Scaffold this active site. Structure first.
Site, mmCIF file in Angstrom:
data_model
loop_
_atom_site.group_PDB
_atom_site.id
_atom_site.type_symbol
_atom_site.label_atom_id
_atom_site.label_comp_id
_atom_site.label_asym_id
_atom_site.label_seq_id
_atom_site.Cartn_x
_atom_site.Cartn_y
_atom_site.Cartn_z
ATOM 1 N N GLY A 8 0.860 -1.179 0.000
ATOM 2 C CA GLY A 8 0.000 0.000 0.000
ATOM 3 C C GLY A 8 0.887 1.216 0.000
ATOM 4 O O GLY A 8 1.717 1.375 0.936
ATOM 5 N N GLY A 10 -0.253 4.534 -0.255
ATOM 6 C CA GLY A 10 -0.986 5.738 0.112
ATOM 7 C C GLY A 10 -0.198 6.588 1.153
ATOM 8 O O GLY A 10 1.013 6.512 1.260
ATOM 9 N N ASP A 32 2.113 -1.070 -4.703
ATOM 10 C CA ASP A 32 0.687 -0.803 -4.776
ATOM 11 C C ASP A 32 0.101 -1.528 -5.977
ATOM 12 O O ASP A 32 0.806 -1.917 -6.937
ATOM 13 C CB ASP A 32 0.443 0.701 -4.836
ATOM 14 C CG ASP A 32 -0.958 1.112 -4.357
ATOM 15 O OD1 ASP A 32 -1.891 1.207 -5.214
ATOM 16 O OD2 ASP A 32 -1.102 1.452 -3.164
ATOM 17 N N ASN A 94 -12.576 -4.420 2.575
ATOM 18 C CA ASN A 94 -11.172 -4.587 3.053
ATOM 19 C C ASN A 94 -10.778 -6.028 3.453
ATOM 20 O O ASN A 94 -9.620 -6.433 3.227
ATOM 21 C CB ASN A 94 -10.860 -3.621 4.208
ATOM 22 C CG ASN A 94 -10.537 -2.203 3.724
ATOM 23 O OD1 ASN A 94 -10.348 -1.998 2.530
ATOM 24 N ND2 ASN A 94 -10.563 -1.234 4.624
ATOM 25 N N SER A 118 -4.669 -1.642 7.719
ATOM 26 C CA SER A 118 -6.062 -1.527 7.188
ATOM 27 C C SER A 118 -7.190 -1.653 8.191
ATOM 28 O O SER A 118 -7.184 -2.571 8.999
ATOM 29 C CB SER A 118 -6.294 -2.588 6.123
ATOM 30 O OG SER A 118 -5.173 -2.680 5.249
ATOM 31 N N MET A 142 -1.056 -2.286 14.241
ATOM 32 C CA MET A 142 -0.841 -1.091 15.062
ATOM 33 C C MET A 142 -2.154 -0.359 15.265
ATOM 34 O O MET A 142 -2.878 -0.132 14.328
ATOM 35 C CB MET A 142 0.306 -0.200 14.522
ATOM 36 C CG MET A 142 0.010 1.157 13.920
ATOM 37 S SD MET A 142 -0.875 2.354 14.931
ATOM 38 C CE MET A 142 -1.726 2.937 13.469
ATOM 39 N N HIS A 174 -9.577 -1.201 18.286
ATOM 40 C CA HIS A 174 -9.349 0.178 17.827
ATOM 41 C C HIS A 174 -10.712 0.729 17.356
ATOM 42 O O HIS A 174 -11.109 0.604 16.183
ATOM 43 C CB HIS A 174 -8.297 0.147 16.713
ATOM 44 C CG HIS A 174 -7.899 1.498 16.185
ATOM 45 N ND1 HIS A 174 -7.544 2.544 17.005
ATOM 46 C CD2 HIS A 174 -7.794 1.961 14.913
ATOM 47 C CE1 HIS A 174 -7.276 3.603 16.260
ATOM 48 N NE2 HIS A 174 -7.378 3.261 14.993
#
Lengths: 313, 313, 313
Positions: A8, A10, A32, A94, A118, A142, A174
């Site tokens: 990824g 981004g 990517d 996702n 993600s 994370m 999270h």
């Protein structure tokens, strides 16, 4: 010689790549799915490297087989949430992307340490584990270090102190069911409870801060019209560092629980150490009320993880 | 001569097909994506037709081109929700399915009247409109008739009266933000307010009933381990009958609003008449408080409809 | 005032309950062993009733004592066969479940008329009789009406005529040893043999039809991935109607033979009349060859019935 692969390219991935270059953590592989994007960011990062006197190698690629022999993998591939959406609304789209990445890691670099980013985070860590066929200690996500930075940042502002040595534990998913622990919050060693006794901060002000810490991800999306990028990247880099340098730091992150905190067979935000061998949970003695809250958060992560597996067929 | 096409051959589709055969409403076309399923149910429905003396034609098929020249289309294709899920959790997976069906209807029978049933209902009606290129009066969703039947059924039980002539209006999205209108509830003509004055029912008992009406969908999933099938099918059949026979009945269903109830450019649960030409909204004079509740429901449907369009890319 | 008890709240039971509500045949008692299932279906059926203007009472229950004073009992409790299995493979598991139901009927409502549906059908009727201690005219099983509807449906398609007044007799067990009688097949009065003389159908086409009729149960299981439910329910409802309304209709169903067709002391598919007093066999004059085929079927049913009694210890 260390190879860091960013699955990824981004905002988050690029900034992680930037921070890794600043500390000379390793050679970068910017991957990517979208053609051209990683090659262009890799160009920009090479010029950045030249100005700041960093010399590590940087490769931008659309061929996922270039991930071979990566020591570290950071996964940001996936869609981000917009205003009004929850992290859980991304579950469908996702989960499918995470499975595909899992399958690619499985065949190309099964010895890597994997940091998943993600959303919704905890859920997607579970998906990655399911289809990747990697040991559970070699996988984490994370989140806690981000939520803890937000909560500590707010505590520090209300107490008129440096955030630098405000530490805390936040347990759980999270999401809205985070469990910040007042007992496990200290200001250069001094427990948060000492500041309540000294009337420098009140139980209501703390509940307020916990609420802002919960909603912070959404609040940044509302204000900046994009999701948080810098703090996530810093958090990720801190986990990479603890792995590469065998530091054995104690963080909160999404980790495989196995009899810890009355939970088994699930990745979920918890207290863990990260070293050479991966991410290892550590159980601390919670009060009944604390553990009740934590279990309740775990339950959502359980439900939504099942939902994710279901929606993948 | 009338052709009724069931896009989706699950529980609801089959029972609809059954009820259509009972009243001789038309020839059936049973469509599903899964091979063999429609052909088998069609065999069963033929044998059922032979025992009950119904003689309409029944075709089970996996070729969606067989939907050509359908006069009526009932869409149940999609995933149903399980225990613990909301209808909104299906948004990702079902929006994509509903778009695909829209596209097919577009090229194969653009003159049909279209009843959408896939959840979350109001949202999926909006998706179907967007990609189908059919006039908005030719598209609706069934929900209000089901919610009304539940509310009226509970009112009837508490008043010790036949449910047969208990009528009511429920406005809004098929979800937790339904707005049952006490003012527009009658028992063979007699307003509900007369029964409160006569102390046969209390305002609290009514609020209890409204709550059970809201949660009823989930309560049947919990108990039966599957979502409701008979009542949805009967409601659908009632709307088919009102179209085929030009009855001009006044229902609640998901319909294109266009300046009605301060709302424009959205399909949402509302009072409407169904006839030969399709589904036509009708605006009744609401109080400030009633309209406020209704607008709040409309807002969710708005948000979630946008969410659905977003997730489709 | 009539009470109809459905012992088993699966597909068939629920649809029977539906059809009974459509014709106002009686109050329903939906029983199953699995908690919550009948209560949830009963909710759905109430809401169905409210939409269609039917007002009979519907009770979903796990307490078998609620079956008290049932006028009619429909038994679908038991396991259904999957692809590749024969009906006879259920003998072990269903015999035990049938016995238990027999015992419950025995102590709670000994005056009921009992329609058995669990497979293998003829065998399970015999089990129910053994342990129920009810008169033999008050017990029967539905099968012939289903097999007849299939055979008549196919004959109607080949002759390009309405199935509506194609009638036929099928003798024998609900299984591979059915004996459809060509001599007793007519199209609005006209014997089938007239259509063979007129070359509108051939003896081979008929044998083909008979083979499809035999395998039809399995062919639906293969295609629909579930066993037939709508046609079985309609057949059942027809037998209920003939009992409640004292119609004295002449069907094929599993009935107590007692010197009829050279058979005694066995329930097996035969020609019978159903009225107020129960199911009563009727013997018609068979040819030697016809009777031979029928006796061969009766033998299997004899063997497998013994097998069932043996496997119940």
């Amino acid at each position: 010689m260390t190879k860091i692969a960013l699955i990824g390219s981004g905002q988050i991935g690029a900034i992680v790549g930037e921070l890794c270059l600043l500390e000379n953590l390793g050679d970068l592989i910017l991957y990517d799915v979208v053609p051209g994007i990683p090659q262009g960011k890799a160009l920009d990062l090479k010029h950045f490297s030249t100005i700041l006197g960093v010399n590590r190698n940087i490769l931008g690629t659309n061929q996922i087989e270039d991930i071979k022999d990566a020591d570290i993998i950071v996964i940001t591939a996936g869609v981000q949430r917009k205003e009004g959406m929850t992290r859980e609304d991304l579950i469908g789209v996702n989960g499918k992307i995470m499975k595909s990445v899992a399958e690619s890691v499985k065949l190309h670099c099964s010895k890597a340490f994997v940091i998943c980013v993600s959303n919704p985070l905890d859920i997607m860590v579970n998906v990655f584990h399911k289809f990747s066929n990697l040991p559970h200690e070699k996988i984490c996500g994370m989140a806690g270090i981000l939520d803890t930075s937000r909560y500590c940042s707010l505590i520090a502002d209300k107490l008129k102190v440096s955030a630098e040595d405000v530490n805390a534990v936040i347990l759980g998913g999270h999401g809205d069911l985070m469990v910040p622990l007042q007992r496990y919050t200290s200001v250069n060693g001094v427990p948060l409870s000492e500041f309540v006794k000294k009337n420098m901060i009140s139980q209501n002000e703390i509940q307020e801060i916990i609420q802002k810490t919960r909603n912070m991800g959404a609040e940044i999306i509302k204000l900046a019209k994009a999701s948080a990028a810098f703090a996530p990247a810093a958090a990720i880099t801190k986990m990479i560092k603890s792995y590469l340098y065998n530091e054995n730091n104690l963080f909160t992150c999404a980790v495989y629980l196995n009899g810890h905190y009355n939970c088994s067979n699930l990745f979920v935000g918890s207290t863990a150490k990260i070293n050479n061998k991966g991410a290892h949970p550590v159980e601390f003695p919670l009060t009944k009320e604390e553990q009740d809250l934590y279990t309740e958060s775990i339950a959502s992560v359980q439900s939504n993880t099942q939902k994710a597996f279901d929606l993948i067929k």
